[PDB]
Curated annotation (Swiss-Prot):
Assigned keywords, A-Z: ATP synthesis, Cell inner membrane, Cell membrane, CF(0), Formylation, Hydrogen ion transport, Ion transport, Lipid-binding, Membrane, Transmembrane, Transmembrane helix, Transport
Gene3D superfamilies: F1F0 ATP synthase subunit C (1.20.20.10)
Subunit composition and interactions: F-type ATPases have 2 components, F(1) - the catalytic core - and F(0) - the membrane proton channel. F(1) has five subunits: alpha(3), beta(3), gamma(1), delta(1), epsilon(1). F(0) has three main subunits: a(1), b(2) and c(10). The alpha and beta chains form an alternating ring which encloses part of the gamma chain. F(1) is attached to F(0) by a central stalk formed by the gamma and epsilon chains, while a peripheral stalk is formed by the delta and b chains.
Taxonomic placement: Bacteria, Pseudomonadati, Pseudomonadota, Gammaproteobacteria, Enterobacterales
Membrane-side (Periplasmic) residue stretches: 1-10, 74-79
Organism in which the protein naturally occurs: Escherichia coli (strain K12)
Site (Reversibly protonated during proton transport): D61
Matching PROSITE patterns: ATPASE_C
Family the UniProt entry places it in: Belongs to the ATPase C chain family.
UniProt membrane topology term: Multi-pass membrane protein
Protein name: ATP synthase subunit c
Purpose of the protein: F(1)F(0) ATP synthase produces ATP from ADP in the presence of a proton or sodium gradient. F-type ATPases consist of two structural domains, F(1) containing the extramembraneous catalytic core and F(0) containing the membrane proton channel, linked together by a central stalk and a peripheral stalk. During catalysis, ATP synthesis in the catalytic domain of F(1) is coupled via a rotary mechanism of the central stalk subunits to proton translocation.
Gene Ontology molecular function, alphabetical: lipid binding; proton-transporting ATP synthase activity, rotational mechanism; proton-transporting ATPase activity, rotational mechanism
Modified residues (N-formylmethionine): M1
């Protein structure tokens, strides 16, 4: 109950920032890897900046899961 509560809040964060933060990780990797291989043959002036949008597309993916996993981790510390 008290134990189950810490179990609930633990596995909640692992379903949360497990799921998205890895989806983030691969997309920064996939998209931002390929998108800079667009920037390379071009100058790295303009399409280096669009390549930001893509690694950032990844960073935002993990953000609400790491902040909710933070809220779940602080709630674990109470429980």
């Amino acid at each position: 109950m008290e134990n189950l509560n810490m179990d609930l809040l633990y596995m909640a964060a692992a379903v949360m920032m497990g799921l998205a933060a890895i989806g983030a990780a691969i997309g920064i990797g996939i998209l931002g890897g390929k998108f800079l291989e667009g920037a390379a043959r071009q100058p790295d002036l303009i399409p280096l900046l669009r390549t930001q949008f893509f690694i950032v597309m990844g960073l935002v993916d993990a953000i609400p899961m790491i902040a909710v996993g933070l809220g779940l981790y602080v709630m674990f510390a109470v429980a």
